[PDB]
């Protein structure tokens, strides 16, 4: 018998107070929007909201009975203690997925998870900050727009984007590409993944074959219209076929789950046969997945040699391809270094907010505060109309709205006032992905090729989490992805009170502040000037 | 021209308040007691108080001007930002030495430190919690006493302890062994190290040769008296010679710095020639250091085959010896699993406190509160007279006093009252090593062979640091030692105020609480009962 978790709607408390209730609803919202919610899996195949259902039930009970001056402590998805702290402390502290680095290799991480000692935490899966496919779509859209500005004269009309991966997060690629004007073709081996994008508005059409997809993409390109087409098939086989048939894409990227232990499908298997092979014969699953990934990466490089702009989109494809024997895949650029890093230098990152009421009018109210607040032509003034027009709510109504240093606390204080005075019906939860300037160390991705070589320095997310606790964030998390990266998340709730006014301002300005500091420290001049302008620095002699 | 840093004494503020002043004095005290203070090196050859002297000068300026509701942020020894937080937040957040695990190997850590991107933080070096050789001496003493209880009928009279390593931390072995009744022989390659122990009261006599050392040790053993003798020589050569000459030690351990990049001396070189070889030809320095370490480990194993109790004392000798080609060294037990783990199950760990005044009467006052507070026969009632009789103050007067869950906050509240009412002249700083139940993940040491296999799970120190911030610790740090371990430190200051009363109780009970939780989670029955008794648990079904 299925759980079918849904977040509570409306304005009735089941907990002792709105801070606790909002976090409960965020946890419930994660599972409501998850890719495999009956396994607690939220996205990327195995990133979970809780270690297991008994752990989930205990977390829920504790949120319903904890006081506003108590702090629940969660360890890799498992509630482990409830401490009396104080009103200005967080209500929940989480550390998920962290393993000392020498033993945090891929094989040992898989063993530890299989024995119940750890979970794959993702970024927003295990600390309850997921808002469905919307959470990533602004960054995927921004990446395509910036590609268009840098390499295609500022327009994707008539241009073709080819990608793979229509999962919980990759599912935003087809919509991102359509919004940016491109004829967008997404490959996924699982027809269920395409149907789920088709039903949530993220995909327009599912093709019946490669030939059919080719025809529909050429039509969109010839009309110079944005639209998206899905193909069912393995990226390795389909990318090869698309080259034989002369697709000639302008952009090629990929957002499959390429982890051979967790959801990469070898050529000729289904998702279920692959999961079963990992269970019964992992050495053969690994060999088969590497052979498919090698072809997959070679197909992208073949497009790159014909003239396509090929980049990695944050799924570790390059490093895993190099390990599977494609050394040239290590030479591919990344969306971060081509498009996102100059935004991080200004503290601009995937800020986001969730209506705890479940009422879409609460989001439309905040979209309205944004249009009265931010200058015309600002990034956010261009984005909110796109979101309004193209993005269907999933679970609790929520909005991705990238904003930068000082802008996040400005918006959150105006929302907190709007909660206090009745324009918004219930608290708003502010959070963000961990793909942000001051909250992640990740040499394969966010911090690849730092100007000063500090790629792997992970002091920075630890400081980000310690500041969030010290500033009164409602919920703070520290996550790792094996031995490859470390990140910090935090949630801060606008409940209309003055206490929340103080917290929203302290937390969010320090959250973007430490990111600006981090990039100024690396030597990025735009960050150094932002740091100086906002008084974020410390004067050190002998410079 | 040398800095010659000394902590300020007396009751005059140079900062805006006693929280800031106490932390300034702790930072100054670290360098005053450091093994190489003109290089900012505190102990283990390269663990530093600050990234460099310019960083140190900026930290000092900021401590003198920051307000009581501001938080200084330090990144691997470098001040990087000053944030407005609140009165109940920490005054200093530090993250030192952390590198994402895939790139945190020994060779890359050495490169990153050489380029100024990171520091070796030790545990108490980079977050200003060091009290000279006293910080480790209770744990070294406790280890010898427990060895005596388990293997020698409860007495070391007439017994011989052989060890190596008379550095800042290894220097406590000769005194620990003497206090426990043994004839204790310590080998060190550097006569300066022995002279410094001889001058601070940690070593009785320096031998002039192996033959001389042998004679003085046999005399102490025959009188059945405790005493210590130092030999100048390389452990590899001296341990071999001691076996040829038939020392027949009862206990053999080692506390050299065995890191070949940082202070392990190959056989036939001096400390200076070795440091120079690392600089000019590190591949040969590594080869020579491994050959010496192999012999060093084989000499210990030869004693073990004659019948000595041989254990590792926390310096990574086993793992580095296995890497140097001695696989049998991996089979040696460790002081943690033989002697310390049952203390961690009760939350008992290296708690410690420092008189900010610099006045020894403030320590004697707290020694007196302890003798009126703790039942006769309690561990601490046996230790304080030993400390009083054998331990010379270094720098600011300070006391190591291992205590367990609820005992630490009990003592700290009584001290805070004694500060409020004049028995103690100025604030007392409470802190601890990071070798503690809830504050370190370390498979080679503190968490080797956890009953449930969770050795490498490092969620726990991250939670320890997040709780310390949320509970108002004065100073919180997160440290790593390469890819091998992660730890959390915190300092909480008894300044006589009610605000400090609240903080001391919240911080310290959560600091020991999370350690008890951590061991109960692993299945240790004494910890599970402590967790139940103090209401630290969370009920989870399907158990
Ligand atoms: N770029 C970013 O900022 C960003 C954001 C979130 C997710 N990610 C990464 O994106 C990846 C995907 O995440 P997700 O949540 O969408 O994962 P998911 O598990 O929900 O979806 C992965 C999809 O890949 C498909 N797939 C697997 N092997 C395939 C193959 N050989 N050919 C074709 N399709 C194949 C599966 O059918 C599935 O639909 C992960 O690596 C995740 O870490 C990055
Ligand atoms: N067991 C514990 O709880 C504990 C506590 C603190 C320190 N430590 C560890 O103890 C070790 C020593 O720390 P420290 O602060 O004393 O270091 P240190 O650098 O101050 O002293 C190391 C000493 O080793 C000597 N030495 C080096 N190579 C030698 C050789 N081949 N033969 C003989 N002597 C040799 C040096 O002369 C030096 O005096 C480190 O690994 C540190 O991490 C463990
Ligand atoms: O942590 C990671 O590197 C992968 C998952 C994460 N990436 C983008 N968004 C997410 O939550
Ligand atoms: O962090 C480590 O493993 C070594 C240094 C540390 N050991 C004991 N005491 C200390 O401060």
From Swiss-Prot, chains A, B:
The protein's Enzyme Commission number: 4.2.1.-
Reactions mediated catalytically: S-methyl-(E)-thiourocanate + H2O = S-methyl-thiohydantoin-5-propanoate
UniProt keyword list: Lyase, NAD, Nucleotide-binding
InterPro entries: Urocanase-like (IPR023637), Urocanase_C (IPR035401), Urocanase_central_sf (IPR038364), Urocanase_CS (IPR023636), Urocanase_N (IPR035400), Urocanase_Rossmann-like (IPR035085), Urocanase_sf (IPR036190)
Cofactor binding annotation: Binds 1 NAD(+) per subunit.
Effect of residue 445 to A: Loss of activity
Keyword NAD: yes
Source domain of life: Bacteria
Any one GO molecular function term: nucleotide binding
Required co-factors: NAD(+)
PROSITE patterns noted in UniProt: UROCANASE
A single BP term in Gene Ontology: L-histidine catabolic process to glutamate and formate
Annotated binding of NAD(+), by residue: 44, 168-170, 188, 193, 234-235, 255, 265, 313
General function of this protein: Hydratase involved in the catabolism of S-methyl ergothioneine. Catalyzes the 1,4-addition of H(2)O to S-methyl thiourocanate, leading to the formation of S-methyl-thiohydantoin-5-propanoate, the second step in S-methyl ergothioneine degradation. Cannot use urocanate or thiourocanate as substrate.
Family: Belongs to the urocanase family. S-methyl thiourocanate hydratase subfamily.
Protein known as: S-methyl thiourocanate hydratase
